[PDB]
Paper text:
CK2α is a highly-conserved, constitutively-active Ser/Thr kinase which is involved in the regulation of many cellular processes, including cell cycle progression, transcription and viral infections. CK2α provides pro-survival and anti-apoptotic effects on the cells, and is often overexpressed in cancer cells, promoting their proliferation by multiple mechanisms such as potentiation of the Akt pathway and activation of NF-Kβ.10,11 Cancer cells therefore rely on CK2α's activity to survive, becoming addicted to high levels of its non-oncogenic activity. We report here the identification of a new binding site for small molecules on CK2α, adjacent to the ATP binding site, and the use of this site to develop a novel type of inhibitor of CK2α with high nanomolar affinity and with significantly improved selectivity compared to other known CK2α inhibitors. Most interestingly, one of the bound fragments induced the opening of a pocket adjacent to the ATP site of the kinase.
Indeed, we observed that the loop is significantly more flexible than previously described.
Residue numbers in the entry: 4 to 329
């Protein structure tokens, strides 16, 4: 395959001191674990467990994430990314790092986020709230991309919103990575329904624009009230579901452009499909969420060619957000 490079924030990391991105060399500053009282486990992932907790020194509600004793490399990567992004718009705030006595591993403490006030993005929102919260997610993505970081796991479960106060956080930076031009990355990132075509066709030289495809998948599910929008039964069927919408000729042009050697299974299952107009997904019960601006925006995110997709900053300038107070 031919190389690719991000068209924005291309060499951010190249120009930084090595300490910025060389997470393996990072030295952890430890707090005191007994400042935190675990209240209940909220969830369990492949690499962590998350808990509702209280900082008993000040009665503050916090979220604690105990990192499973997997590859230490991944632990330092998440910590370094969270410290580099700390204070950025809508980025979850890492307040402390303590050693859990039971797991014997680092436990990350997050402040200004709690399970009572903030909830995962599982709500059915109005047109205005979709635009408002999508703009808040874009502020987080433009910030992390501008800091040379790709999130690689954008999905509803990684967006926390306090609806009463209209606050949002982009969470779970466990799959995030530093972008370096020319670097090959693992394609086993993101949840199936949110995987970009680059991951499905095994193109490793991807970049920040992967997060923009995932965002487009979220948007399409919200405006069309179809969860998930691209509902593949496995990774092979996931690309067929995308191709039934966007067509196979632009997919094959994308594969041709980057000289991707396609898995032969895809040539057997893809067949030939033409692009559908978005109005094919509009019906009486979602038409109130659809506008010409929403369709144009969706169209500019959901493009096979990762270099052609809107970037997070270009998305912030799009007409879909003109109505959002900024």
């Amino acid at each position: 395959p031919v190389p690719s490079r991000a068209r924005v924030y291309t060499d951010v990391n190249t120009h930084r001191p090595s300490e910025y991105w060389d997470y393996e060399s990072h030295v952890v500053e430890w707090g005191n674990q007994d400042d935190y009282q675990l209240v209940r486990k909220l969830g369990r992932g492949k690499y962590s467990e998350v808990f509702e907790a209280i900082n008993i020194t000040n009665n503050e509600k916090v979220v604690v994430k105990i990192l499973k004793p997997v590859k230490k490399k991944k632990i330092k990567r998440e910590i370094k990314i969270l410290e580099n992004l700390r204070g950025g718009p809508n980025i979850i705030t890492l307040a402390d790092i303590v050693k859990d006595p039971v797991s014997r591993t680092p436990a990350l403490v997050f402040e200004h986020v709690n399970n009572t006030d903030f909830k995962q993005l599982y709500q059915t929102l109005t047109d205005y709230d979709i635009r408002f919260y999508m703009y808040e997610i874009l502020k987080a993505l433009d910030y992390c991309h501008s800091m040379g970081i790709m999130h690689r796991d954008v999905k509803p479960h990684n967006v926390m919103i306090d609806h009463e106060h209209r606050k949002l956080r982009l969470i779970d930076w466990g799959l995030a990575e530093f972008y370096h031009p020319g670097q090959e990355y693992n394609v086993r990132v993101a949840s199936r329904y949110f995987k970009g075509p680059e991951l499905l066709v095994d193109y490793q030289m991807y970049d920040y624009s992967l997060d923009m495809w995932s965002l487009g998948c979220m948007l399409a599910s919200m405006i069309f009230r179809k969860e998930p929008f691209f509902h593949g039964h496995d990774n092979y069927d996931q690309l067929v579901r995308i191709a039934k919408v966007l067509g196979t000729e632009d997919l094959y042009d994308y594969i041709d452009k980057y000289n991707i050697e396609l898995d032969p299974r895809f040539n057997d299952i893809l067949g030939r499909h033409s692009r559908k107009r978005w109005e094919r997904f509009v019906h009486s019960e979602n038409q109130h969420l659809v506008s010409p601006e929403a369709l144009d925006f969706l169209d500019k995110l959901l493009r096979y060619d990762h270099q052609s997709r809107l970037t997070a900053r270009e998305a912030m300038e799009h007409p879909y957000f003109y109505t959002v107070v900024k």
